mmCIF file of C-alpha atoms in Angstrom:
data_model
loop_
_atom_site.group_PDB
_atom_site.id
_atom_site.type_symbol
_atom_site.label_atom_id
_atom_site.label_comp_id
_atom_site.label_asym_id
_atom_site.label_seq_id
_atom_site.Cartn_x
_atom_site.Cartn_y
_atom_site.Cartn_z
ATOM 1 C CA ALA A 1 -15.868 -20.187 -4.782
ATOM 2 C CA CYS A 2 -12.792 -18.452 -6.194
ATOM 3 C CA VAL A 3 -9.524 -19.942 -7.448
ATOM 4 C CA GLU A 4 -7.487 -16.969 -8.661
ATOM 5 C CA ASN A 5 -9.672 -13.963 -7.847
ATOM 6 C CA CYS A 6 -12.616 -13.305 -10.165
ATOM 7 C CA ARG A 7 -10.873 -10.023 -10.974
ATOM 8 C CA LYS A 8 -7.789 -11.380 -12.739
ATOM 9 C CA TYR A 9 -9.646 -14.605 -13.527
ATOM 10 C CA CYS A 10 -12.072 -12.619 -15.681
ATOM 11 C CA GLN A 11 -9.705 -9.825 -16.709
ATOM 12 C CA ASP A 12 -7.757 -12.541 -18.524
ATOM 13 C CA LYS A 13 -10.813 -13.464 -20.592
ATOM 14 C CA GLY A 14 -11.974 -9.879 -21.016
ATOM 15 C CA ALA A 15 -13.286 -7.822 -18.108
ATOM 16 C CA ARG A 16 -12.635 -4.509 -16.358
ATOM 17 C CA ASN A 17 -13.216 -6.025 -12.919
ATOM 18 C CA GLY A 18 -14.688 -8.979 -11.050
ATOM 19 C CA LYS A 19 -15.289 -10.661 -7.700
ATOM 20 C CA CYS A 20 -16.995 -13.530 -5.875
ATOM 21 C CA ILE A 21 -20.752 -13.650 -5.296
ATOM 22 C CA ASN A 22 -23.197 -15.716 -3.242
ATOM 23 C CA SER A 23 -24.237 -17.772 -6.270
ATOM 24 C CA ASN A 24 -20.555 -18.223 -7.109
ATOM 25 C CA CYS A 25 -18.787 -15.474 -9.054
ATOM 26 C CA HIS A 26 -19.495 -12.381 -11.155
ATOM 27 C CA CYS A 27 -17.388 -10.082 -13.333
ATOM 28 C CA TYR A 28 -17.811 -6.402 -14.195
ATOM 29 C CA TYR A 29 -17.576 -4.756 -17.614
#
């Protein structure tokens, strides 16, 4: 599940993009 959007959630730790996935979540570099 997501808490604050994988996008910003990952972008804060280093990531161009991100989103939620079946397994759970996944970012995008």
